[PDB]
Amino acid sequence: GAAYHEWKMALFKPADVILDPDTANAILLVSEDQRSVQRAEEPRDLPDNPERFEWHYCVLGCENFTSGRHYWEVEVGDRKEWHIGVCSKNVERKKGWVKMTPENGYWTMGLTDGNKYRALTEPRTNLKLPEPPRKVGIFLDYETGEISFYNATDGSHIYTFPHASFSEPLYPVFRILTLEPTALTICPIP
Numbered sequence: 001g002a003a004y005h006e007w008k009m010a011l012f013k014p015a016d017v018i019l020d021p022d023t024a025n026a027i028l029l030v031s032e033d034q035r036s037v038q039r040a041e042e043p044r045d046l047p048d049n050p051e052r053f054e055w056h057y058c059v060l061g062c063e064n065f066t067s068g069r070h071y072w073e074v075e076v077g078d079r080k081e082w083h084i085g086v087c088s089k090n091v092e093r094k095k096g097w098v099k100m101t102p103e104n105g106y107w108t109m110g111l112t113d114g115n116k117y118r119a120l121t122e123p124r125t126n127l128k129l130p131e132p133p134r135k136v137g138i139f140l141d142y143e144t145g146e147i148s149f150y151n152a153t154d155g156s157h158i159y160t161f162p163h164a165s166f167s168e169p170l171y172p173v174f175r176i177l178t179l180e181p182t183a184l185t186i187c188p189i190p
């Protein structure tokens with residue numbers, strides 16, 4: 001099952017994703033090396049910042065993409081809740097209750113309640129993975145509208161969104177809602 005995944009990684013360019021603290025919801029803590037994020041017990045008290053998510057428990061990478069083919073890997077470990085993918089630069093960061101859907105500028109999938117994998121389509125799409133991933137590969141092909149997710153350990157395909165037509169820069173995006181020991185960690189380029 002790994003053959004195509006290996007071929008795709010050799011084609012797509014490895015992205016060096018560093019988390020941007022100025023975007024992170026106040027309930028989130030970004031590590032000193034900007035490679036991991038954890039949910040805090042209580043929100044931090046920060047001054048006003050137009051980059052920050054006020055409602056979704058989200059953080060972005062520092063760099064966006066407007067063309068090309070890119071790949072990065074996220075260690076999710078045994079964390080029981082997480083959603084990851086990309087989002088448009090112009091998502092509404094200051095508006096309560098926006099649903100994270102492609103129409104609102106998010107292409108994300110992940111895990112909830114320990115064992116329920118979903119793609120964040122409208123309505124949400126339930127997934128069934130034969131094995132729980134510990135590392136997830138995200139593939140972005142801007143020109144073809146491809147945003148794909150793979151189990152990065154055994155190379156199995158997880159989900160690809162309906163072909164998109166991107167018109168805004170895209171950021172890696174990470175969401176965590178629950179308080180638990182395991183953080184979300186970006187794997188660096190070898």
Ligand SMILES: C/C(=C\COP(=O)(O)OP(=O)(O)O)CO
Pocket residue numbers: 055056057058099100120124175177
């Ligand atoms: C409360 C919150 C996110 C949960 O949104 P939702 O409650 O709409 O559920 P989901 O289908 O997981 O997006 C803040 O990021």
